[PDB]
RNA sequence: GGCUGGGAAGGCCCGGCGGGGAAGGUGGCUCGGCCGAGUGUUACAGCCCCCCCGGCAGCAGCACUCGCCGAAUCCCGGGGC
RNA sequence: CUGCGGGAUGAACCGAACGCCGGGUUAAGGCGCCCGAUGCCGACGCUCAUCAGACCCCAGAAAAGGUGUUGGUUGAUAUAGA
RNA sequence: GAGCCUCGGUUGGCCUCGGAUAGCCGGUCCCCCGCGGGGUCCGGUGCGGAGUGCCCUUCGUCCUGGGAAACGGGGCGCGGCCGGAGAGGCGGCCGCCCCCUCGCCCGUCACGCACGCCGUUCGUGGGGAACCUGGCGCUAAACCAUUCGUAGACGACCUGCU
């Protein structure tokens, strides 16, 4: 009953608008791997935009001024918050349902994560256009834990490779076992393929 | 003047008969307009621009849509333009490839609006003529004059991005 | 089975299968499926009318004072004639629906909505 | 023995940008995302079920804490499967983005 | 690495539009994203059709680029495009989708029972095979 | 119902006239097993296309939905609020 | 002396003018999220900006340049070989 | 076991990396590397059927009376071996007792059949507070007061005292 989305290959605003709309409808949304987010335009454009945002601060007291979060997950969180009525109680309650993470944390490392084709770079962006990765942008503006995240993601990918190898073995054995006892399930298979299955 | 899916209208008109001139001559024009009501207005505008004739002093003798003779054949159409820019006016010749003459004129209007920011009211259509494979000046039309023409669909960006919005599979662009 | 004089639908699921006796149902509260059994060769009793299924209790002129007057009796009687009519109808209905395979088990099942199932998408 | 109502979400009231009409609610039925599948749900009964501190009566059962506000589907709302609904009492606006069950038995098929 | 090309005589499948889900053959190319199409054996007349709404299969019949609707039909019949298309996995999957769409509640109950038995049998066999494989490994 | 007393299209086609893409053909060359595939040159039609002479029910703004205007030349039925 | 919908904001702008309500439909404006509605399998083209651009009043720019790119006009020469 | 308050809900999916002018699955006759990984070649699909346009589970009960399939499940079943550290907070692998004949097709009836009328059906033995059963373990520290100056407007801070 909770949406888990993989942030790799998704555009910032395109995914943020959809996530905010779903969150306002009472849906619980989890966004994972926020370093895979990419933004349209060359890297220098987005670097300059984030530096210009960094310049924004209260002259009399920067502590009370804007909070420039450097983590990619917090950057995505702020972009989503910009698309919500966060000043109202309803907006805050909706924003409480949102949850973002750098990398893929252990609570969600063993879950299937969905992707939104309406926010993917391969779909929404021309192949000849340039883009910038959110992880590299964050690392060059103050982020500290890019290498640790990369190492943990490599370990997680190795574990996922082991699990996927086991799944391949299980599926291959399942397919062979179906062939072994195909004579005892012929009547069950015929009715399945009569109504539009296994075809 | 606006634009839609234009149709070709043949409009015939003359000045009102007078005792001085018992039998005034008849004039006809080719007008591409969304409907006959605006076709009559365009005919009167062009006739007043050319002849000493106005709507009050004249009448419309016949107004009728001109059907495409060969809608099922692909043809090359040459259109001679007369439009106004921010600066002075200019004369243009453009070529389009379409099944119908009205479709060619609509493509001309769309292309003029896209490339030169020219509205419909600033554009005057002078002559539209069908041309064979030869006598074509624009390489864009000419590159399709090939019996053994081959081209694939390299990057098929999928539609239905909002048909079921959350999916576990990433889409495919190679087909 | 039939539509009565009042316009209500004479409904009867097999008692041995659905535990539904001879009852009336309304059209607006019933989903009509695309599954029909051959019921032409049955004889529904004529005395089974709309006036036959009606309430009888709640008479006025009792004392009414106290913890009494129609809060008791705790039940409604079976009215054994109903059982005779139900048995007579079922003895004819049951073999015809048993002729079609898996039809009795389908009747024993209960319709419900599950995840990913939408009534407008499915066809009934 | 199972669920006999379709899932819907109270998206909000009928409104413009700066004016809100609380006598008509907007519903988001799950699985319907076009102005062509909403014809099935037209006229369907809808209820907003909630619980409260005090006990209330219950038809065919002992008193419970559950109270409901009954409603009716009126018309579709703008090409996206959104449905306009009217209730006997306007929704408390606390149920924004909460579950509203639309029944299946104003049957006409 | 392309195996599908817009060639004169290429058979195309219409994804969406008025003639959705109907085969059609390319006659001539009108523009970059528009071509003259003709569907005589599939109840499709000769009119322009954009490349967006068509996905072309691996069937190509040979006829001149501007044939008058008569020789293309003859080539379609000689090549027997309908039978070849019906033999393909693509049409079988489309028909499976249609069968799923038209399945009634009684048919859904039958399918539920059939899967209920079949999956149990298959998973019992899978467990036995897993035990045998573990025995072989040790 | 009208129109260009609709424009094209579909089928059997018959007796002709010319023109053009450039093909079961030829051919410099190239790629594989005489054939298959790709380019050019004069180029008739056994791949075709277009105009002119003429005639058949097969039509109908056609559920092969290629683009009109419509209603004493217009009526019936159903659903929701 | 005048409320109402839109122009984020608002004297005079656009629409439209006021008894209390229910249903339907519009104007001017809009339909990624805030925010009601394109969650159309919208159509044709143009544009890369290390100062992009994004709607009367209106909240900002000129002369002069660019083989950056996209169309048009005119003029020559090229198998007697540019 | 009652006993107050507060709400959301109304089957789950336990998972590769990934590219888009490309990808998925096996055998790998062949080679290399630590049962597995990598490469060459070969064979099947690709508008994805090893499809989220998807998969998994049935959502009436009980009697006996047959066929197909079959040793599966349960007693918050009891004891060992592990994986999992990013924010693990979940599962996997083995030993011993007892109980049941569960899934699919048909016979066989019986289940307040409450006589048409709404919040039915669950995650939930939900979360917070106060009171009734037992088995296994507990014995205080903080502050004030006093004291000191590495501290200090007052608070605060650094220290000592069976
Ligand atoms: Mg409840």
DSSP labels, B35-49: SHHHHHHHHHHHHHH
Whether the Cβ atoms of residue B156 and residue B174 lie closer than 8 Å to each other = yes
Q: What number of other Cβ atoms are within 10 A of residue B146's Cβ?
A: 12
Does B170 contact strand H, using a CB cutoff of 7 Å?
yes
Cα separation, C108 vs C92, in Å, equals 18
For testing contact with chain C, the best of D33, D107, D108 (most C CBs within 10 A): D107
For chain A, how are helix, strand and coil distributed in percent, rounded to 5? 55, 10, 35
Q: Is B132 helix (H, G, I), strand (E, B) or coil?
A: coil
Cα separation, A60 vs A64, in Å, equals 9
Query: Rg of the Cα trace of chain A?
Result: 22
**Is the CB of residue C51 less than 8 Å away from at least one CB of chain E?**
no
Nearest residue, CB atoms, E31 vs list B97, B148, B175: B97
> Which is nearest to A23 in space by CA: A76, A66, A71, A69?
A76
C-alpha distances in Å from residue C44, one per residue of A135, C11, C22, C50, C89: 77, 12, 11, 14, 7
Distance of CA E80 to the CA centre of its chain: 15
C-alpha distances in Å from residue B142, one per residue of B105, B115, B132, B133, B136: 19, 20, 11, 7, 7
Cα separation, A79 vs A99, in Å, equals 13
C-alpha distances in Å from residue E32, one per residue of A74, B5, B93, B97, E28: 45, 20, 21, 10, 12
Q: Is B161 helix (H, G, I), strand (E, B) or coil?
A: coil
Q: At what angle do helices A72-81 and A12-24 cross, to 10 degrees?
A: 60
For strand G, which nucleotides have at least one atom less than 7 Å from a protein CB?
Answer: 4-7, 22-24, 31-46, 48-50, 52, 70-73
For testing contact with chain D, the best of C119, C123, C124 (most D CBs within 10 A): C119
Q: What 8-state DSSP symbol labels residue B144?
A: T
Cα separation, D58 vs D72, in Å, equals 21
Q: What number of other Cβ atoms are within 10 A of residue B28's Cβ?
A: 13
- How many CA within 13 A on the CB side of residue B39? 23
Whether the Cβ atoms of residue E103 and residue C123 lie closer than 8 Å to each other = yes
Using CA atoms of A7, A11, A16, A18 in order, give the dihedral in degrees to the nearest 10. -90
- Of all nucleotides, the one whose C1′ comes closest to residue E121's CA is H69
Whether the Cβ atoms of residue A36 and residue A10 lie closer than 8 Å to each other = yes
Q: Which two tokens stand for residue A151?
A: 């190492």
Q: Which residues contact B164 (CB under 8 A, 6 or more apart)?
A: none
Resolution value (Å, 1 decimal): 2.8
Cα separation, A109 vs A30, in Å, equals 12
> Which is nearest to B154 in space by CA: A89, E16, A102, E4?
E4
Whether the Cβ atoms of residue C37 and residue C100 lie closer than 8 Å to each other = yes
Q: Which two tokens stand for residue E110?
A: 């039958």
Residue B167 pairs in a beta bridge with A115
Parallel, antiparallel, or unpaired for β A28-32 and A2-6? parallel
Please report all neighbours of E, defined by 3+ CB atom pairs within 8 A.
A, B, C
Cα separation, B74 vs B86, in Å, equals 35
Residue located via tokens 């705790």 = C74
Contacts made by residues A12-15, CB under 8 angstroms, sequence distance 24+ = A12/A37, A12/A38, A12/A39, A12/A76, A12/A79, A12/A134, A13/A79, A14/A116, A14/A118, A14/A119, A14/A124, A15/A76, A15/A116, A15/A119
Q: Which two tokens stand for residue B10?
A: 């043949």
Query: Euclidean distance between the first and final Cα of chain C, in Å?
Result: 19
């Amino acid at each position: 009953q909770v949406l888990v989305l993989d942030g790799r290959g998704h555009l910032l605003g395109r995914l943020a608008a959809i996530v905010a709309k779903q969150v306002l409808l009472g849906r619980k949304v989890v966004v994972v791997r926020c370093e895979g987010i990419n933004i349209s335009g060359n890297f220098y454009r987005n670097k300059l935009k984030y530096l210009a945002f960094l310049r924004k601060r209260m002259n009399t007291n920067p502590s009370r001024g804007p909070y420039h979060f450097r983590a990619p997950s917090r950057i995505f969180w702020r972009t989503v918050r910009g698309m919500l009525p966060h000043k109202t109680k309803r907006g805050q309650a909706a924003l409480d349902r949102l949850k973002v993470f750098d990398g893929i944390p252990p609570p969600y490392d063993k879950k299937k994560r969905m992707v939104v084709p309406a926010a993917l770079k391969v779909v929404r962006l021309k192949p000849t256009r340039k883009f910038a990765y959110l992880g590299r942008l964050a690392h060059e503006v103050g982020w500290k834990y890019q290498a640790v995240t990369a190492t943990l993601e490599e370990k997680r990918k190795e574990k996922a490779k082991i699990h996927y190898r086991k799944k391949k073995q299980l599926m291959r054995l399942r397919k062979q076992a179906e062939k072994n006892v195909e004579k005892k399930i012929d009547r069950f298979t015929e009715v399945l393929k009569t109504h539009g299955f296994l075809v | 003047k606006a634009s839609g899916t234009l149709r070709e209208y043949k409009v015939v008109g003359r000045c009102l008969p007078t005792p001085k001139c018992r039998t005034p001559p008849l004039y006809r024009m080719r007008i591409f307009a969304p409907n006959h009501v605006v076709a009559k207005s365009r005919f009167w505008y062009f006739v007043s621009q050319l002849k000493k004739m106005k709507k009050s002093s004249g009448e419309i003798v016949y107004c009728g849509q001109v059907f495409e003779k060969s809608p099922l054949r692909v043809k090359n159409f040459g259109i001679w333009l007369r439009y106004d820019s921010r600066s002075g006016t200019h004369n243009m010749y453009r070529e389009y490839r379409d099944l119908t003459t009205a479709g060619a004129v609509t493509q001309c209007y769309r292309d003029m609006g896209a490339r030169h920011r020219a509205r419909a009211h600033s554009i005057q259509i002078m002559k539209v003529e069908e041309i064979a494979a030869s006598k074509c000046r624009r390489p864009a039309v000419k590159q399709f004059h090939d019996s053994k023409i081959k081209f694939p669909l390299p990057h098929r960006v999928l539609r239905r991005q909002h048909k079921p919005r959350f999916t576990t599979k990433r889409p495919n662009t190679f087909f | 089975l039939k539509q009565l004089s009042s316009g209500l639908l004479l409904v009867t699921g097999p008692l041995s299968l659905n535990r539904v006796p001879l009852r009336r149902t309304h059209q607006k509260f019933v989903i009509a499926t695309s599954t029909k059994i051959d019921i032409s060769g049955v004889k529904i009793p004529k005395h089974l009318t709309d006036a036959y299924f009606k309430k009888k209790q709640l008479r006025k002129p009792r004392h009414q004072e106290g913890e009494i007057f129609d809060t008791e009796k705790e039940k409604y009687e079976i009215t054994e004639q109903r059982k005779v009519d139900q048995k007579a109808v079922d003895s004819q209905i049951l073999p015809k629906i048993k002729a079609v395979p898996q039809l009795q088990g389908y009747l024993r099942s209960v319709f419900a909505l599950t995840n990913g199932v939408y009534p407008h998408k499915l066809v009934f | 023995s199972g669920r006999l109502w379709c899932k819907a979400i109270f998206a909000g009231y009928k409104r413009g940008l700066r004016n809100q009409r609380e006598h008509t609610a907007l519903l988001k039925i799950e699985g319907v995302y076009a102005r062509d599948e909403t014809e099935f749900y037209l006229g369907k009964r809808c209820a907003y079920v909630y619980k409260a501190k005090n006990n209330t009566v219950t038809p065919g059962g002992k008193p419970n804490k559950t109270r409901v506000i009954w409603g009716k589907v009126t018309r579709a709302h703008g090409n996206s499967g959104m449905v306009r609904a009217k209730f006997r009492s306007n929704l408390p606006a606390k149920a924004i983005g909460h579950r509203i069950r639309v029944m299946l038995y104003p049957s006409r098929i | 690495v392309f195996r599908r090309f817009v060639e004169v005589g290429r058979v195309a499948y219409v994804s969406f539009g008025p003639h959705a889900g109907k085969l059609v053959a390319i006659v001539d190319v009108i523009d970059q994203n528009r071509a003259l199409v003709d569907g005589p054996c599939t109840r499709v007349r000769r009119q322009a059709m954009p490349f967006k709404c068509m996905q072309l299969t691996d069937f190509i019949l040979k006829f001149p680029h501007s044939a008058r609707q008569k020789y293309v039909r003859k080539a379609w019949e000689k090549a027997d495009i309908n039978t070849k298309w019906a033999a393909t996995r693509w049409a079988k999957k489309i028909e499976a989708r249609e069968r799923k769409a038209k399945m009634t509640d009684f048919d859904r109950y039958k399918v539920m029972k059939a899967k209920k038995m079949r999956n149990r049998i298959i998973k019992n066999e899978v467990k036995k095979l897993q035990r045998a494989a573990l025995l072989k490994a040790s």
